[PDB]
Design a protein around this motif. Structure first.
Motif, PDB file in Angstrom:
ATOM      1  N   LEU A  59       0.815  -1.209   0.000  1.00 23.02           N
ATOM      2  CA  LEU A  59       0.000   0.000   0.000  1.00 23.02           C
ATOM      3  C   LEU A  59       0.851   1.264   0.000  1.00 23.02           C
ATOM      4  N   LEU A  60       2.111   1.162   0.429  1.00 25.87           N
ATOM      5  CA  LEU A  60       3.065   2.246   0.218  1.00 25.87           C
ATOM      6  C   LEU A  60       3.443   2.357  -1.255  1.00 25.87           C
ATOM      7  N   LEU A  61       3.556   1.214  -1.938  1.00 23.59           N
ATOM      8  CA  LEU A  61       3.906   1.203  -3.353  1.00 23.59           C
ATOM      9  C   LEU A  61       2.763   1.714  -4.221  1.00 23.59           C
ATOM     10  N   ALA A  62       1.515   1.481  -3.807  1.00 25.75           N
ATOM     11  CA  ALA A  62       0.378   1.975  -4.577  1.00 25.75           C
ATOM     12  C   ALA A  62       0.256   3.492  -4.494  1.00 25.75           C
ATOM     13  N   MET A  78      -4.342  -5.883  -9.134  1.00 28.73           N
ATOM     14  CA  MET A  78      -4.180  -7.181  -9.781  1.00 28.73           C
ATOM     15  C   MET A  78      -2.794  -7.770  -9.548  1.00 28.73           C
ATOM     16  N   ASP A  79      -1.778  -6.922  -9.402  1.00 31.51           N
ATOM     17  CA  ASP A  79      -0.425  -7.397  -9.158  1.00 31.51           C
ATOM     18  C   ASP A  79      -0.083  -7.497  -7.679  1.00 31.51           C
ATOM     19  N   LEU A  80      -0.938  -6.988  -6.794  1.00 33.36           N
ATOM     20  CA  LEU A  80      -0.629  -6.878  -5.372  1.00 33.36           C
ATOM     21  C   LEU A  80      -1.567  -7.709  -4.500  1.00 33.36           C
ATOM     22  N   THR A  87     -11.691  -4.526  -2.189  1.00 32.41           N
ATOM     23  CA  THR A  87     -11.023  -4.578  -0.896  1.00 32.41           C
ATOM     24  C   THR A  87      -9.766  -3.712  -0.886  1.00 32.41           C
ATOM     25  N   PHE A  88      -9.101  -3.596  -2.042  1.00 29.15           N
ATOM     26  CA  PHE A  88      -7.867  -2.821  -2.172  1.00 29.15           C
ATOM     27  C   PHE A  88      -8.094  -1.331  -1.938  1.00 29.15           C
ATOM     28  N   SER A  89      -9.282  -0.825  -2.267  1.00 28.59           N
ATOM     29  CA  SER A  89      -9.599   0.564  -1.960  1.00 28.59           C
ATOM     30  C   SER A  89     -10.039   0.741  -0.512  1.00 28.59           C
ATOM     31  N   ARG A  90     -10.480  -0.340   0.136  1.00 32.52           N
ATOM     32  CA  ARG A  90     -11.091  -0.234   1.458  1.00 32.52           C
ATOM     33  C   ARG A  90     -10.053  -0.044   2.561  1.00 32.52           C
ATOM     34  N   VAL A  91      -8.922  -0.753   2.478  1.00 33.64           N
ATOM     35  CA  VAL A  91      -7.901  -0.695   3.527  1.00 33.64           C
ATOM     36  C   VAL A  91      -7.090   0.594   3.472  1.00 33.64           C
ATOM     37  N   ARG A  94      -7.579   2.827   6.231  1.00 32.18           N
ATOM     38  CA  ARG A  94      -6.889   2.422   7.449  1.00 32.18           C
ATOM     39  C   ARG A  94      -5.409   2.794   7.401  1.00 32.18           C
ATOM     40  N   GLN A  95      -4.755   2.545   6.264  1.00 32.83           N
ATOM     41  CA  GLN A  95      -3.302   2.677   6.184  1.00 32.83           C
ATOM     42  C   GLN A  95      -2.870   4.139   6.123  1.00 32.83           C
ATOM     43  N   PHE A  96      -3.526   4.939   5.280  1.00 28.42           N
ATOM     44  CA  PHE A  96      -3.152   6.338   5.094  1.00 28.42           C
ATOM     45  C   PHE A  96      -4.311   7.300   5.322  1.00 28.42           C
ATOM     46  N   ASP A  97      -5.446   6.810   5.840  1.00 31.47           N
ATOM     47  CA  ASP A  97      -6.631   7.595   6.211  1.00 31.47           C
ATOM     48  C   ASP A  97      -7.224   8.384   5.046  1.00 31.47           C
ATOM     49  N   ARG A  98      -7.057   7.905   3.816  1.00 30.76           N
ATOM     50  CA  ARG A  98      -7.511   8.638   2.646  1.00 30.76           C
ATOM     51  C   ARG A  98      -8.166   7.678   1.665  1.00 30.76           C
ATOM     52  N   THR A  99      -8.813   8.257   0.665  1.00 30.90           N
ATOM     53  CA  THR A  99      -9.374   7.513  -0.447  1.00 30.90           C
ATOM     54  C   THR A  99      -8.297   7.313  -1.512  1.00 30.90           C
ATOM     55  N   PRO A 100      -8.313   6.180  -2.227  1.00 34.01           N
ATOM     56  CA  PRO A 100      -7.399   6.025  -3.375  1.00 34.01           C
ATOM     57  C   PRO A 100      -7.679   6.971  -4.539  1.00 34.01           C
ATOM     58  N   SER A 101      -8.817   7.664  -4.550  1.00 29.23           N
ATOM     59  CA  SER A 101      -9.092   8.700  -5.536  1.00 29.23           C
ATOM     60  C   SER A 101      -8.616  10.077  -5.074  1.00 29.23           C
TER      61      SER A 101
END
Length: 107
Positions: A59-62, A78-80, A87-91, A94-101
């Motif tokens: 999630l640091l790499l994303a 798909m690679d991670l 689920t990849f957008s959901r955590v 938790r990890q960085f307190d933000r949305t992936p968008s």
DNA sequence: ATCGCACGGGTGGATAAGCGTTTACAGTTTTCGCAAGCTCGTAAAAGCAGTATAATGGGAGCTGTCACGGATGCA
């Protein structure tokens, strides 16, 4: 060789290979130990978890693939270790307190 | 050491459903643009009647030559 030298090698074991399909059946076999036993010694050396920390570098790499590269959310997952972005957008809340968008907008 | 087994935590996984955002694929409204068709107007084309000294019978370049039969038709 003490086990604090083992896990010091394990912090440079994954730093180039978090873009690869790296699972525990590779990490345990190419360390000389068994599947479970690497996790019991991992607590007493760095106070954190192992199977979530490989995600914590994933999630640091994303985030550094979003703030630099134009790759979408759906197939960075798909690679991670994910089969979709649901689920990849959901955590990421938790990890960085933000949305992936929302990360790429605020500079 | 070397490693499972378990209680339990964390999750991944399979449908599913969510969110605001910028265009489809449904259907009509509007205006502007140029025609093809009709009506028209007159200068051009088209047609018609008359012309009062006197005049009254073609040929008009033709054919220039072959020779053998049949039917026809007067005589």
């Amino acid at each position: 060789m003490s086990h604090q030298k083992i896990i010091q090698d394990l912090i440079a074991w994954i730093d180039e290979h978090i873009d690869q399909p790296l699972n525990i059946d590779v990490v345990a076999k190419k360390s000389g130990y068994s599947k479970w036993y690497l996790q019991r010694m991992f607590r007493t050396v760095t106070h954190q978890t192992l199977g979530d920390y490989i995600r914590q570098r994933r999630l640091l790499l994303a985030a550094v693939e979003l703030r630099t590269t134009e790759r979408p959310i759906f197939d960075i997952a798909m690679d991670l270790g994910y089969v979709s972005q649901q689920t990849f957008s959901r955590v990421f809340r938790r990890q960085f307190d933000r949305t992936p968008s929302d990360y790429r907008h605020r500079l």
